[PDB]
């Protein structure tokens, strides 16, 4: 029939597409831009709002805003503009014609979940709706019903233990350090090497250096000095201006903040310790399966060496007899979205949607149990 629409609203990037597709058709920055002074002509800022890539490219004349902070919607007017844009300009379909599956961050407040439900039914007039926890979709994507998902995105990093299909809320832990923080951190240490990056285009360069040259060191200490005595770890980066530069140890120093947030004046356990902490809050019978199914999702887990470093660190914290296994799907930047695409395409899911009729009779508060 009519494909369901699947949208994963990341703090940094929105992934949108049609259920049944193997990947999101549209992946764009979760930004809403508005003219500081709107015009009456082409190229002057005639539209009352811009979303995504366009808002980004028209930086010079717009005021950009991010309605999602740490995976939580904090500006509903702006969120609705992103959603409107997503349906009509990105997917190019009217929402009233399709079931819509949205994702949410672990531990998303109940008021937010109901507001989202209300907007979808009352504003976009969707015929069917469902909301899924991001980490759970990633777990399904990996072909499992049990595991502990480490989802490090742009805005937040969550550790979510899931047993037999159900997350264990009491054990979910959040680390308030993610990709945005890493880019800013690389921007600082690169700056202290004698280079300059402070504007958004410059920051975008640093983000590019982060996603292309950075890596997680297996043993930080020994790695450091291996850059001290050699130029074995140095790679050259060709700037947009032609000028070429050399990134050295900043390559592994930046992502190291994931293991030691202290480097950002942040007093929080790193991702390895937090994964152990979460597993420890779970029932014994479940821990063995969690240790054996540590699933990585999110762009910030894309750093080469991260799985090898997590395997080592977790092995050291777990009992010696414990089989520890780290699963890092190559497609983990889209794991959440793919999980949603699969879920919404299942013949068996067709009775799971909250209907318009149901919403009409019981309202938005039905979302919590309906999407449990």
């Amino acid at each position: 029939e009519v494909a369901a629409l699947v949208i994963d609203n990341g703090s940094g990037m929105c992934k949108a597409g049609f259920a049944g597709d193997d990947a999101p058709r549209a992946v764009f920055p979760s930004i809403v831009g508005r003219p500081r002074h709107q015009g009456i002509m082409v190229g002057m800022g005639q539209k009352d709002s811009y979303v995504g890539d366009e808002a980004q490219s028209k930086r010079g004349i717009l005021t950009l805003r991010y309605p999602i902070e740490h995976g939580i919607v904090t500006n509903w007017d702006d969120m609705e503009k992103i959603w409107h844009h997503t349906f009509y300009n990105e997917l190019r379909v009217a929402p009233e014609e399709h079931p819509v599956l949205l994702t949410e961050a672990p531990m998303n407040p109940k008021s937010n979940r109901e507001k989202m439900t209300q907007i979808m039914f009352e504003t976009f007039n969707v015929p069917a709706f469902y909301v899924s926890i991001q980490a759970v979709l990633s777990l399904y994507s990996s072909g499992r019903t049990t595991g502990i998902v480490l989802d490090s995105g742009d805005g937040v990093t969550h550790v979510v233990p899931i047993y037999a299909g159900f997350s264990l809320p009491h054990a979910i832990l959040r680390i308030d350090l993610a990709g945005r923080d890493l880019t800013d951190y690389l921007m600082k240490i690169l700056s202290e090497r004698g280079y300059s990056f402070s504007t958004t285009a410059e920051r975008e360069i640093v983000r590019d250096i982060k996603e292309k040259l950075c890596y997680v060191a297996l043993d930080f200490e020994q790695e450091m000095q291996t850059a001290a005595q050699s130029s074995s770890i140095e790679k050259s980066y060709e700037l947009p201006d032609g000028q070429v530069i050399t990134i050295g140890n900043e390559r592994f120093r930046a992502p190291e903040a994931l293991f030691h947030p202290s480097v950002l004046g942040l007093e929080s356990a790193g991702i390895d310790q937090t994964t152990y902490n979460s597993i420890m809050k779970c029932d014994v019978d479940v821990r063995k399966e969690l240790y054996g199914n540590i699933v990585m999702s999110g762009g910030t887990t894309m750093f080469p060496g991260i799985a090898e470093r997590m395997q080592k660190e977790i092995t050291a914290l777990a009992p010696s007899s414990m089989k520890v296994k780290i699963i890092a799907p190559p497609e983990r930047k889209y794991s959440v979205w793919i999980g949603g695409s699969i879920l919404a395409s299942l013949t068996t899911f067709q009775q799971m949607w909250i209907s318009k009729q149901e919403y009409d009779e019981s309202g938005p508060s039905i979302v919590h149990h309906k999407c449990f």
Binding site: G20, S141, G143, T145, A164, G165, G339, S341, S345
Partner: protein
């Protein structure tokens, strides 16, 4: 549970073994005469139902993942497993069975062992 699917209605009614193959986002029964034959490019769901002394039914749900099955097949096999467990009131124990690492329990369901077959139904993607 609010799930309406013909195979869900047939699931775990009498003691025995039931096998379904994931075929393009649907759960399709495997003919009984072929139980034991598994396509390595496919994913399947196996339900072993045993009659308990007190009259209750004990369930073991195994989702078998072929070495070459696509992401939609393994993802659906996992989700179908959770859904069936939920439909059967959660009385089952879920087992993930990867080609080459099947549990002794799973293998024990097949007297003549397993017959791997290269190939399978195309991805639903």
């Amino acid at each position: 549970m609010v799930v309406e699917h013909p195979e869900f209605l047939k699931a775990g009614k009498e003691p025995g073994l039931q096998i379904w193959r994931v075929e393009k986002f649907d759960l399709v029964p495997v003919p009984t005469n072929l139980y034991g034959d598994f396509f390595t490019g496919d994913a399947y769901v196996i339900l072993k139902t045993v009659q308990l002394r007190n009259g209750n039914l004990q369930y073991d749900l195994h989702y078998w993942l072929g070495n070459e099955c696509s992401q939609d097949e393994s993802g659906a096999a996992a989700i179908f497993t959770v859904q069936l467990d939920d439909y059967l009131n959660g009385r089952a124990v879920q087992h993930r069975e990867v080609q080459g690492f099947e549990s002794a329990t799973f293998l024990g369901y097949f007297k003549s062992g397993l017959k791997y077959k290269k190939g399978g139904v195309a991805s639903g993607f």
